[PDB]
Design an enzyme around this catalytic site. Sequence first.
Site, PDB file in Angstrom:
ATOM      1  N   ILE A 140       0.819  -1.196   0.000  1.00 17.52           N
ATOM      2  CA  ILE A 140       0.000   0.000   0.000  1.00 17.52           C
ATOM      3  C   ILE A 140       0.866   1.264   0.000  1.00 17.52           C
ATOM      4  O   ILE A 140       0.332   2.338   0.245  1.00 17.52           O
ATOM      5  CB  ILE A 140      -0.983   0.040   1.191  1.00 17.52           C
ATOM      6  N   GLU A 142       8.667   0.838   1.336  1.00 15.61           N
ATOM      7  CA  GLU A 142       7.547  -0.044   1.055  1.00 15.61           C
ATOM      8  C   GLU A 142       6.724  -0.290   2.311  1.00 15.61           C
ATOM      9  O   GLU A 142       7.255  -0.608   3.376  1.00 15.61           O
ATOM     10  CB  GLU A 142       8.031  -1.399   0.555  1.00 15.61           C
ATOM     11  N   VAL A 143       5.417  -0.164   2.152  1.00 16.89           N
ATOM     12  CA  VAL A 143       4.463  -0.383   3.242  1.00 16.89           C
ATOM     13  C   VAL A 143       3.493  -1.501   2.853  1.00 16.89           C
ATOM     14  O   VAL A 143       2.934  -1.464   1.760  1.00 16.89           O
ATOM     15  CB  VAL A 143       3.668   0.905   3.493  1.00 16.89           C
ATOM     16  N   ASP A 189      -0.650  -0.545  13.974  1.00 22.06           N
ATOM     17  CA  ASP A 189      -2.095  -0.780  13.849  1.00 22.06           C
ATOM     18  C   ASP A 189      -2.527  -0.305  12.459  1.00 22.06           C
ATOM     19  O   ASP A 189      -2.127   0.776  12.016  1.00 22.06           O
ATOM     20  CB  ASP A 189      -2.857   0.001  14.913  1.00 22.06           C
ATOM     21  N   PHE A 190      -3.349  -1.092  11.767  1.00 25.43           N
ATOM     22  CA  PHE A 190      -3.790  -0.680  10.415  1.00 25.43           C
ATOM     23  C   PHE A 190      -4.890   0.388  10.440  1.00 25.43           C
ATOM     24  O   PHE A 190      -5.809   0.321  11.264  1.00 25.43           O
ATOM     25  CB  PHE A 190      -4.247  -1.887   9.621  1.00 25.43           C
ATOM     26  N   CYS A 191      -4.821   1.339   9.520  1.00 28.21           N
ATOM     27  CA  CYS A 191      -5.871   2.364   9.372  1.00 28.21           C
ATOM     28  C   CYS A 191      -6.463   2.246   7.985  1.00 28.21           C
ATOM     29  O   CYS A 191      -5.719   2.229   6.979  1.00 28.21           O
ATOM     30  CB  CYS A 191      -5.285   3.765   9.565  1.00 28.21           C
ATOM     31  N   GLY A 201       5.362   4.324  -3.622  1.00 28.48           N
ATOM     32  CA  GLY A 201       6.193   5.500  -3.821  1.00 28.48           C
ATOM     33  C   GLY A 201       6.303   6.430  -2.637  1.00 28.48           C
ATOM     34  O   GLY A 201       7.057   7.400  -2.707  1.00 28.48           O
ATOM     35  N   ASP A 255       6.523  16.857   8.709  1.00 29.54           N
ATOM     36  CA  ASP A 255       6.056  16.357   7.427  1.00 29.54           C
ATOM     37  C   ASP A 255       4.531  16.355   7.349  1.00 29.54           C
ATOM     38  O   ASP A 255       3.910  15.414   6.837  1.00 29.54           O
ATOM     39  CB  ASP A 255       6.651  14.980   7.141  1.00 29.54           C
TER      40      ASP A 255
HETATM   41  C1  LIG Z   1       3.132   7.745   4.597  1.00 36.66           C
HETATM   42  N1  LIG Z   1       3.815   6.512   4.950  1.00 36.66           N
HETATM   43  C2  LIG Z   1       3.069   5.526   5.678  1.00 36.66           C
HETATM   44  N2  LIG Z   1       3.513   4.504   6.407  1.00 36.66           N
HETATM   45  C3  LIG Z   1       2.579   3.727   6.990  1.00 36.66           C
HETATM   46  C4  LIG Z   1       3.075   2.539   7.836  1.00 36.66           C
HETATM   47  C5  LIG Z   1       1.221   4.075   6.781  1.00 36.66           C
HETATM   48  C6  LIG Z   1       0.024   3.525   7.216  1.00 36.66           C
HETATM   49  N3  LIG Z   1      -0.980   3.319   6.300  1.00 36.66           N
HETATM   50  C7  LIG Z   1      -2.157   2.790   6.691  1.00 36.66           C
HETATM   51  N4  LIG Z   1      -3.229   2.543   5.728  1.00 36.66           N
HETATM   52  C8  LIG Z   1      -3.320   3.153   4.444  1.00 36.66           C
HETATM   53  C9  LIG Z   1      -4.640   3.158   3.881  1.00 36.66           C
HETATM   54  C10 LIG Z   1      -4.866   3.720   2.634  1.00 36.66           C
HETATM   55  C11 LIG Z   1      -3.791   4.284   1.919  1.00 36.66           C
HETATM   56  C12 LIG Z   1      -2.488   4.284   2.441  1.00 36.66           C
HETATM   57  N5  LIG Z   1      -1.422   4.880   1.608  1.00 36.66           N
HETATM   58  C13 LIG Z   1      -1.479   5.101   0.175  1.00 36.66           C
HETATM   59  C14 LIG Z   1      -1.727   6.503  -0.300  1.00 36.66           C
HETATM   60  C15 LIG Z   1      -0.546   7.424  -0.106  1.00 36.66           C
HETATM   61  N6  LIG Z   1       0.601   6.798   0.507  1.00 36.66           N
HETATM   62  C16 LIG Z   1       0.516   6.390   1.899  1.00 36.66           C
HETATM   63  C17 LIG Z   1      -0.855   5.959   2.359  1.00 36.66           C
HETATM   64  C18 LIG Z   1      -2.243   3.703   3.721  1.00 36.66           C
HETATM   65  N7  LIG Z   1      -2.395   2.446   7.997  1.00 36.66           N
HETATM   66  C19 LIG Z   1      -1.420   2.642   8.943  1.00 36.66           C
HETATM   67  C20 LIG Z   1      -0.197   3.192   8.579  1.00 36.66           C
HETATM   68  C21 LIG Z   1       0.846   3.440   9.604  1.00 36.66           C
HETATM   69  N8  LIG Z   1       1.654   3.633  10.389  1.00 36.66           N
HETATM   70  S1  LIG Z   1       1.348   5.411   5.774  1.00 36.66           S
END
Ligand SMILES: CNc1nc(C)c(-c2nc(Nc3cccc(N4CCCNCC4)c3)ncc2C#N)s1
Lengths: 313, 252
Positions: free
Chosen positions: A19, A26-27, A90-92, A22, A135
């Site tokens: 997710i 990497e997440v 924790d996931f959002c 870029g 940021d």
């Molecule tokens: C900005 N960098 C990030 N790191 C983490 C670990 C993130 C994070 N993201 C989520 N969920 C989530 C849901 C929908 C979209 C996204 N991404 C895509 C769009 C733009 N790029 C980043 C977000 C992420 N839940 C928890 C965490 C945390 N910590 S975001």
Amino acid sequence: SVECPFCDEVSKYEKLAKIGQGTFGEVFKARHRKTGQKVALKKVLMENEKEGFPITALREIKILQLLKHENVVNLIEICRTKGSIYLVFDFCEHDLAGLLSNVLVKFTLSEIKRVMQMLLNGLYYIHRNKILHRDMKAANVLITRDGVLKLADFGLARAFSLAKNSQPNRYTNRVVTLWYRPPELLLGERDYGPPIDLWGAGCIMAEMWTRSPIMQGNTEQHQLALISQLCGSITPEVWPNVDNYELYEKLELVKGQKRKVKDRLKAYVRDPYALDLIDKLLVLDPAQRIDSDDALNHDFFWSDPMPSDLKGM
Amino acid sequence: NNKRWYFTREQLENSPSRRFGVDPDKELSYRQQAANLLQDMGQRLNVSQLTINTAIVYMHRFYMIQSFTRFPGNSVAPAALFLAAKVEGQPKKLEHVIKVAHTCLHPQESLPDTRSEAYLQQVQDLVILESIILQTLGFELTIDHPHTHVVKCTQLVRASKDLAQTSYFMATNSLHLTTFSLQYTPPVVACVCIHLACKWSNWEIPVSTDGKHWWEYVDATVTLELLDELTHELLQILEKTPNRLKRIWNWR
Ligand SMILES: CNc1nc(C)c(-c2nc(Nc3cccc(N4CCCNCC4)c3)ncc2C#N)s1
């Protein structure tokens, strides 16, 4: 192989989907293999890193461990691999950059109030704890399936401190995405504080109606131009002593501009109080810029329609 | 959690090392020596006493999980110090730490060609070790030290520059000499140090007007029975340590 009671292998989580292609590292979205608990994984990048474990990662970890608050993303634990290292969060479900860039998605004034309230509350908390986020942007604001906003991405964050002795702090100037970067930094400030995060709060607030980043510069000079076209031009009258960056001269900033913040946004926003608050967030002199405490007190949060929950969507 | 890095005496007897046949007395030295190597390197690396104290705690905690039989203190100290300097914001370079550690451990010996395979190996070994430390400690790197608490307390009781400096001295030595860090919260250790420094200076802190003893302003749990038991334990080992007491001894 060796005893390791307090560092679990990340294989306890099952990867579901990338997710963050870029956005920084990497997440991954993942699933706890026993309980189904959804989490976010971030690998710690090791691109030399000729100095062992990144001092940058230590800093972030230290800060994530310190910050515990309803409106700040929650670091659960750190996992190894058996070699790499992962931050587990924790996931959002949502990301404000995403929701805002989605034509289907719609906000009432009441919800927008609530969002800004949580965000400002998160800022108040991190600042109270001597942390600068550095940021602030839509993409770094998350919202849970239950409508709780979380400040995320502390990768550029840093602890700060007060004065002292008339020796200025020498923090890094290369901070904050260009579009969200405050005047101070663009004029070369290294002794800045919480007000830089609030400038970002301003940019995001405005973005809740405009559905798009209000000032999309290409370079620092372009950004400074754009900011002047909106907030008036940088004047020692408007911003006492601004004249003393060695970059005041070099910038050769525009000088006919007059404040258009409320006029240019007048269209989208409509609500008087909203416009007033945004105006006090996008203030040029960091020292005259509203803080989270006063912002929370602003009539915007205390008039009809009162702030409401994030229901549906 | 909260009781994670504090151990009962019974827990301390059953340490990873014992398990592998290292006597309690032997183990203790191993610790004191690691603390010595840390102090020595740290001074040459020109890092703060605070950073050295951090690496010492890392070392103490590390060996509640790992054994000296598998990980020798001369291997761990440099990695620990390397890590603590990064954390305390006084980062020192990997190649630099390697050099200083080399001269300490091998004063006569000559540093290997940085081009060499042997040198590239030890660089890689330090990095591997730092990672084993990070993971053993489960990434818990923020350390509270007694010293913060000493300063506060010794101001509130208007101690002389001398008394206060002696208490700070006791604090630093408790890390090198004792496992108090594995057993007692920093604020409690701070009281132990201030108490001993008083005994040593013939200083007595006047019982507040409420009839409250000073340490009660500092930690609820603390009692005089505990304080005397502890100052005694600490003083004993100071007595075994050649020249240490000389440093705070009133020569007049
Ligand atoms: C900005 N960098 C990030 N790191 C983490 C670990 C993130 C994070 N993201 C989520 N969920 C989530 C849901 C929908 C979209 C996204 N991404 C895509 C769009 C733009 N790029 C980043 C977000 C992420 N839940 C928890 C965490 C945390 N910590 S975001």
